[PDB]
From a paper:
To generalize this engineering approach for crystal contacts, a non-ADH-homologous enzyme was selected to apply the established strategies to the Nostoc sp. PCC 1720 ene reductase (NostocER). This oxidoreductase from the old yellow enzyme family (OYE, EC 1.6.99.1) catalyzes the trans-hydrogenations of activated alkenes, demonstrating its industrial relevance as a biocatalyst. As OYEs are strongly dependent on cost-intensive NADPH as a cofactor, Mähler et al. engineered NADH-accepting variants (NostocER1) by exchanging NostocER loop regions at cofactor-binding sites to ER loop regions from Achromobacter sp. JA81 and Acaryochloris marina with a higher NADH affinity. For this study, the NostocER1 Loop1,5 variant (NostocER1-L1,5) was selected as an example protein for the rational introduction of Lys–Glu interactions at crystal contacts to demonstrate the impact of rational single amino acid exchanges on the crystallizability of proteins and enhance protein crystallization.
Residue numbers in the entry: 14 to 370
Amino acid sequence: NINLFSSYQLGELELPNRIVMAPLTRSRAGEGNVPHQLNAIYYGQRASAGLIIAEATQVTPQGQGYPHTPGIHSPEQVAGWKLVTDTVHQQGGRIFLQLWHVGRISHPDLQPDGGLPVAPSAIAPKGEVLTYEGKKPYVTPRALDTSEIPAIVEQYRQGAANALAAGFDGVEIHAANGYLIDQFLRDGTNQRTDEYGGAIENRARLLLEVTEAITSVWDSQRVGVRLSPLTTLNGCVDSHPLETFGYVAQALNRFNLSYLHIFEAIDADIRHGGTVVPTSHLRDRFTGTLIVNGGYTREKGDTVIANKAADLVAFGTLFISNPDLPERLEVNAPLNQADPTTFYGGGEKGYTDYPFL
Ligand SMILES: Cc1cc2nc3c(=O)[nH]c(=O)nc-3n(C[C@H](O)[C@H](O)[C@H](O)COP(=O)(O)O)c2cc1C
């Protein structure tokens, strides 16, 4: 009778419970997009998680899309992240870094030399993007040349190598929420006519090449992949999500990965006649560890573990406000209410000052 509090063997790591801290952008990086002591305190406070997945962290300068997110491309960033991994390990926790490239979801003001964001296809996102000077309209990204795809893969490989030097326990490839890899996956954002567009094997190719490069740096059971099959975030939608995401789930088996992590869009059920990609479909086609996420509670997490629908359950919002979420869920304590006004940017307030039980 396994439940959220059951231990789990994730490759060589023994997780003390099945509760994962989802990756959460908090936009509190210092100069040079470098993590600092306050970020180490924040993650250390949450080290009772079975596994922490750190916030999305750009693998290269062009992969930044929002002010003050941390990177994993410079020696100063590695040193700052080692403060974080040192603290988490001292607290007896485990932490993976989520490796990011935002693709088109950026602005020239955040790019080297004020250049265009890059993407599979030159299709502007709708609406506005935050810059240092304030909100501005998006521009149209540059479509990468076929010859530049190896450079993207190499940027991910280097980000993964830097994460290894920073003392992480593993890495998660951010292939969700409409960022660069997801832009290639989904046909709403990828109109390419080379071997990276069109057929599903072509749209999946960037993710698979990135995965192969990263599993050349890390043992493969320390590499996870995140997908979000039915999100509409960032204007990124696929026309045949069951076929697309079911193909990816099966295609990842041969890499012997740490896990596949699914963020189940919060409106998946109401935004269709029903969910067009039940997670069961992905559970059936990926044979490894499955993390599920999106609106989970103690009740719902225990149910999915008991029914064998998932192995691990990641919590986002609740881990912002409850540093000791595992203990609170275990003893059925009150939960602190998250304050969205301090999710992104700032200092201690709404970051390290949510109380323990
Ligand atoms: C403030 C905030 C920042 C987030 N940043 C990231 C991120 O860096 N990477 C990611 O893959 N998802 C990110 N997400 C999505 C969360 O990981 C999670 O999937 C989502 O909030 C749903 O889970 P929940 O209902 O447990 O919060 C973020 C969500 C929030 C609320």
